[PDB]
Amino acid sequence: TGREILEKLERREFTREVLKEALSINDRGFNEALFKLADEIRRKYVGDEVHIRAIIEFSNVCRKNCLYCGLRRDNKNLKRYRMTPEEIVERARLAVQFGAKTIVLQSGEDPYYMPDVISDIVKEIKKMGVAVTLSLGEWPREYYEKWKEAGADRYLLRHETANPVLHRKLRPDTSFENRLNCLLTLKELGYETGAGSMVGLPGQTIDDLVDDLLFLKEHDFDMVGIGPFIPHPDTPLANEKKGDFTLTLKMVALTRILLPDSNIPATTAMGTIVPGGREITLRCGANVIMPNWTPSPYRQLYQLYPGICVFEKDTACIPCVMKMIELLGRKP
Ligand SMILES: C[C@H](CCC(=O)NCCC[N+](C)(C)CCCS(=O)(=O)[O-])[C@H]1CC[C@H]2[C@@H]3[C@H](O)C[C@@H]4C[C@H](O)CC[C@]4(C)[C@H]3C[C@H](O)[C@]12C
Ligand SMILES: C[C@H](CCC(=O)NCCC[N+](C)(C)CCCS(=O)(=O)[O-])[C@H]1CC[C@H]2[C@@H]3[C@H](O)C[C@@H]4C[C@H](O)CC[C@]4(C)[C@H]3C[C@H](O)[C@]12C
Ligand SMILES: Nc1ncnc2c1ncn2[C@@H]1O[C@H](CSCC[C@H](N)C(=O)O)[C@@H](O)[C@H]1O
Ligand code: SF4
Ligand SMILES: [Cl-]
Ligand SMILES: [Cl-]
Ligand SMILES: [Cl-]
Numbered sequence: 001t002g003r004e005i006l007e008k009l010e011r012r013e014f015t016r017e018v019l020k021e022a023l024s025i026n027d028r029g030f031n032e033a034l035f036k037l038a039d040e041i042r043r044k045y046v047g048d049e050v051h052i053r054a055i056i057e058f059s060n061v062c063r064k065n066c067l068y069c070g071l072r073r074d075n076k077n078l079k080r081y082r083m084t085p086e087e088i089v090e091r092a093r094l095a096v097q098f099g100a101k102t103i104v105l106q107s108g109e110d111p112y113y114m115p116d117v118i119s120d121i122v123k124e125i126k127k128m129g130v131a132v133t134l135s136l137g138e139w140p141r142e143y144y145e146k147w148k149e150a151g152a153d154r155y156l157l158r159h160e161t162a163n164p165v166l167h168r169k170l171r172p173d174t175s176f177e178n179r180l181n182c183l184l185t186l187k188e189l190g191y192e193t194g195a196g197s198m199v200g201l202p203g204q205t206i207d208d209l210v211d212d213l214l215f216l217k218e219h220d221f222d223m224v225g226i227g228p229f230i231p232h233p234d235t236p237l238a239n240e241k242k243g244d245f246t247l248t249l250k251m252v253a254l255t256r257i258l259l260p261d262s263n264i265p266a267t268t269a270m271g272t273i274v275p276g277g278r279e280i281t282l283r284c285g286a287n288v289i290m291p292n293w294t295p296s297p298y299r300q301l302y303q304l305y306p307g308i309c310v311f312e313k314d315t316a317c318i319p320c321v322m323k324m325i326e327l328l329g330r331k332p
Contacts, residue, residue, distance in 0.1 A: 026246075055104035056088055133194075228270065230305035
């Protein structure tokens with residue numbers, strides 16, 4: 001029964017069948033025990049602080065054509081935007097004035113900025129003594145070099161799916177082979193690396209998720225970003241089925257059990273498909289929240305998927321997460 005799989009997880013007996021079983025069992029008692037276990041493992045290793053890492057989505061211009069993503073280059077209806085370096089810096093400064101100690105710079109793959117514009121922004125943002133995390137997709141090692149020289153500390157590059165065939169199909173411009181290489185180049189260059197994948201992708205199976213789990217535990221990532229697949233109306237997957245919240249929550253919990261030292265965000269996608277989804281995820285293994293500091297009107301134009309916090313004032317949302325972290329009994 002579920003008790004058997006549970007004890008192997010406590011003994012850290014992580015094998016392909018144990019995780020497949022764990023992901024397969026849909027008994028309410030087993031699920032709730034799994035989350036309680038991950039909540040306790042979270043509390044033990046990373047404590048009660050919920051890291052608040054503000055993110056700025058400074059460009060929705062992308063060169064790739066990912067089938068799931070609304071920023072794919074074939075999305076013609078989406079209005080495109082680019083923030084100026086002055087706008088990104090004064091925005092990060094505002095986030096630091098509100099208490100952010102990490103600045104996450106994310107965009108579609110927009111060549112306009114690469115690589116010297118990113119370096120200048122990073123150099124400026126690093127003058128405030130905060131960690132800078134980049135999430136800019138796949139670029140040459142030479143580009144990763146310069147950004148590390150500019151003061152960059154962390155890089156986010158979700159592996160999306162550890163199935164090479166499912167990867168190539170969903171991301172035509174590249175492969176899991178290249179994606180895995182970019183991750184290894186970053187760890188090699190001294191970056192703190194974040195991986196992760198989507199749950200509920202079309203054609204994704206329980207075995208794929210176990211592969212995602214095994215891939216994660218193998219490379220022992222500093223950070224892991226996990227979210228449900230949300231179909232975008234202007235994409236080749238507009239009518240596929242969204243990722244399941246409970247199943248995605250189990251991927252978070254098992255990630256916490258497998259990587260008890262890792263920083264695991266409570267992604268916005270989780271709060272999008274279930275009201276209060278992020279709060280739930282923070283109590284099942286997650287210990288990071290990434291408030292959106294992208295200013296209007298660009299924020300509504302950054303549609304990886306259709307989205308929360310879209311009407312709230314550009315500020316306003318950091319005091320919201322601090323309130324949320326408080327009502328959860330955690331610290332910021
Ligand atoms: C709030 C509800 C219902 C609580 C409830 O209704 N329980 C009875 C109250 C007990 N009292 C103290 C009042 C004394 C009993 C006398 S009384 O007769 O009034 O029940 C409980 C029931 C199941 C609980 C979740 C699951 O575990 C999974 C997971 C474990 C993590 O770790 C923490 C997060 C999460 C999502 C949990 C959150 C929360 O915790 C839930 C929803
Ligand atoms: C931007 C303005 C003007 C003054 C200013 O520009 N201040 C820079 C602060 C920079 N830091 C955060 C690094 C200082 C930390 C001091 S600390 O005591 O944490 O060491 C200052 C004045 C009052 C400040 C808010 C309140 O206070 C309440 C709350 C405290 C949290 O914490 C962070 C969030 C929040 C909402 C604050 C945000 C921001 O800050 C405010 C708006
Ligand atoms: N439709 C969707 N549903 C859920 N997550 C999505 C999504 N579309 C994109 N994402 C997630 O959003 C993340 C940021 S994509 C932005 C950075 C860069 N272009 C890159 O691809 O890495 C991706 O890793 C992906 O996992
Ligand atoms: S996931 Fe990233 S690289 Fe792929 S289309 Fe979206 S923004 Fe571009
Ligand atoms: Cl931090
Ligand atoms: Cl980060
Ligand atoms: Cl997200």
